[PDB]
Design a protein around this nucleic acid. Structure first.
Lengths: 92, 78, 97, 102, 92, 98, 98, 81
DNA sequence: GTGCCGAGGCCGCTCAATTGGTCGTAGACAGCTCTAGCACCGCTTAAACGCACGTACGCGCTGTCCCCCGCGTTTTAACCGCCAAGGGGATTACTCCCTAGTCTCCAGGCACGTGTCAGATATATACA
DNA sequence: TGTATATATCTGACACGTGCCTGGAGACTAGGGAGTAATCCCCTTGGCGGTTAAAACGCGGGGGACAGCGCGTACGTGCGTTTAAGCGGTGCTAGAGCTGTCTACGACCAATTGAGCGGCCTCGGCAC
């Protein structure tokens, strides 16, 4: 019924800081941040296919919206971390 | 109901930003600026509630109304 | 018999309210103001329990963030005490007016 | 075998791919290639916030992550402040004191 | 090929100020204003149906997005002008 | 035979607006017939509102054609039209304030 | 000779530049500035005839609006001549970093 | 194409200050105006490169400047078509 | 008043507006289940209003540097129009292989109930 | 006198692990997005050398910025004590949300015939 990311945020925290935890008030803060980013990535990539006369949205539209919504610095590290899972999922 | 915010209530809000000395006419001006900003969020929540044929403002009506103004608030389902 | 200097007591409140996370404005006077403004748009309106806390968090964050840029105008004009005319100056640059 | 374990990510691939096809647009198609890159951006941005917030929690001798530490980690960083331009409920602002008030 | 509103802007001006004209530099300003408003009306009405678990955009979604974007005053006059053409088109 | 804009008493095309709405939002959604008639009245009322203030100011400068300079004074000069149109007109300048 | 007072000449330029909608910044020196910034992002880049004029119109509109908020800080601080320290004060309220 | 930061001369900034309402201009304004404009220009030019590389093109068209200025918040009309 | 190139009005070509007909499945609105909203009972004790009196910010007046305006000779390099060569944008025809759409199989995900330790109270001493 | 540091306590609420149901994953076939070459000819970048707008160096002197002495009224700090915030709760019944049934009104499909895009030409608005 309630589709949230309450089971995926705690799994990433255990991989970096296993000696930590979370609270009820802190769960809504991390859940609202993921939903706000997904609304901006899907919104920016939707205009790319319309402005370039396209339709099929592949992996090229997702990487384009990363460097636009991020003012550099952190946008460079997301490219190497994004392409690492694409080749691993295909070549398997 | 403009007399809701008292004098020490406005002083406590200025101590968080970094205001040392507060003038006496600040209490008369802070009530007018806050009423203008509150008129844009309350009116936006009424239009979002009447669209669903509801008479009670839910918790999601305030989040969707504050996103268009620019003051996005987290910790309330979005 | 023991009075502090005009400035030491006001400076102690800055290091106290900035570390706390509770709400500064009370909930009873703030709830009556929302029902009055919303009565002009739609009569016999109702608000949920979580709707009151959502409007209070946005009203306190807006007043605190506005006082940060307002106090900078007083120091830039070789002054310490804030003035009511400094609020309209910072609101014009941000785009509120 | 799920699509999240094969790519080495913790975010669900089937959930992101199903949500993208229900937004925009009607004539637009969202293949399986776009769902893999979309889950990597959401996972890297989530671990970056939890890394800066978890370091400050070791100074106050606490265990669970409090909303106060989430504000000091986002607003205190010069790279995550321009991206996250929202407002954390129950966290306040960064305690700063000007030099002309002492 | 080039779908623009170059033939509809000059028609409205002839009904109010017939002794006036238009230029090429002034046509691009009026054409970009209508395109920017149409992108905001459809963008605001799209969230009205998704957040309320709906999938059809009727006349109720267009009127709801008018008051949300316009800061009053002019939003009230658009209601009497918008509903005048809806009833006339149906009852004909 | 009979156009949809002539029956409703509007100048904006109804078939063009209804066709462009189905390609934007949304995916598994449908655009109602009543939404195209209401959307044509909003774009028509906003167009005549800007041309009304611009045509009155252009008649005082002994000019017939509408110049891009008069379009800026008609929007920036009005308080209600300044918050709605938050863009920038190329080749129009600002309000002469002194 | 016929030397005017330092003040009656600078006020005449306010009523002149605000009436005309011409470009204040030149086109040739501004073209070499855009090619230098876009040289580190991608080598061998080109710009169309209309792409150069679009970037020049946005740069003049940003500098004009920035000087309006900066001049207001001088009147509040009982001053007339603008200072570089007043530019950083108005950029902090709008949210411009660095 | 080297050291093109000297394009904005001293009288070029004086023409832009008279449009807003600036009477007297200090001498250190020219050293600060060039640095502020360079920061703002680095956000629109960089955004136009990413929009051009997505279409497998090498020339920055006129449409890429309008789409990059709308996201930053400074929408410019007239160059839409 | 004197000269030049953009705007208004025509004819022609062919994309896509408007009609009629058939039928999937959105949403109007019928009644029922039971969360959590509004109004009012009263004790305890945080915090708001009223007001004493020095303390120290905002105020205005007016020196005296050293800020950069205003006007003019000499200077660097912009705007103008026209030349020739080839980057890489435009729409134009063909098939590989991306990913929309249908049943069936069986596990990830998420509502409710369950232990016991994170971190909130407010008593201690020892300092900033 | 004012904030930290210290050991002790208290019971709300985080983490754990099942019961069970959508909605993730996999094999298959149908059909249209856009792969990446093959085309013509748009309008970028580089070349020369005239004319004449406006950039740069230097002059003299007005009126700007902002150091610092000191008048006099707004607001900091804190004792006394007004009157409404917030806590423990209990009763009534608005209107949010979940699950039924079957009519209101868009999508799809396929031949008509008029809306409106592209290219021409003659002024007649407004630039020097």
């Amino acid at each position: 019924r309630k589709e949230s990311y309450a089971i995926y945020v705690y799994k990433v925290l255990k991989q970096v800081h296993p000696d930590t935890g979370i609270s009820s008030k802190a769960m809504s803060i991390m859940n609202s941040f993921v939903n706000d980013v997904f609304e901006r990535i899907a919104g920016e990539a939707s205009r790319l296919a319309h402005y370039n006369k396209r339709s099929t949205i592949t992996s090229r539209e997702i990487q384009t919206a990363v460097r636009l919504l991020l003012p550099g610095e952190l946008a460079k590290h997301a490219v190497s971390e994004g392409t690492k899972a694409v080749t691993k999922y295909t070549s398997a | 109901n403009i007399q809701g915010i008292t004098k020490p209530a406005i002083r406590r809000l200025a101590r968080r930003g970094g205001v040392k000395r507060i003038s006496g006419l600040i209490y008369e001006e802070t009530r007018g600026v806050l009423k203008v900003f509150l008129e844009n969020v309350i009116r936006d929540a009424v239009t979002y509630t009447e669209h669903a044929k509801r008479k009670t403002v839910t918790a999601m009506d305030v989040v969707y109304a504050l996103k268009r103004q620019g003051r996005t608030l987290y910790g309330f389902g979005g | 018999p023991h009075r502090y200097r005009p400035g030491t007591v006001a400076l102690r409140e800055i290091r106290r309210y900035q570390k706390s996370t509770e709400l500064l404005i009370r909930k009873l006077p703030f709830q009556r103001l929302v029902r009055e403004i919303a009565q002009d748009f739609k009569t016999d309106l109702r608000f949920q329990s979580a709707a009151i806390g959502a409007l209070q968090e946005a009203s306190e964050a807006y007043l605190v963030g506005l006082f940060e840029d307002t106090n900078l105008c007083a120091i830039h004009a070789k002054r310490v005490t804030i003035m009511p005319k400094d609020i309209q100056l910072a609101r014009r640059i941000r785009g509120e007016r | 075998v799920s699509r999240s374990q094969r790519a080495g990510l913790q975010f669900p691939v089937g959930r992101i791919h199903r949500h993208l096809k229900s937004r925009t647009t009607s004539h637009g198609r969202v293949g399986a290639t776009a769902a893999v890159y979309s889950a990597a951006i959401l996972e890297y941005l989530t671990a970056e916030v939890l890394e800066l917030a978890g370091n400050a929690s070791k100074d106050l001798k606490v265990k669970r992550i409090t909303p106060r530490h989430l504000q000091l980690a986002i607003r205190g960083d010069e790279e995550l402040d321009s991206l996250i331009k929202a407002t954390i409920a129950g966290g306040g602002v960064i305690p700063h004191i000007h030099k002309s008030l002492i």
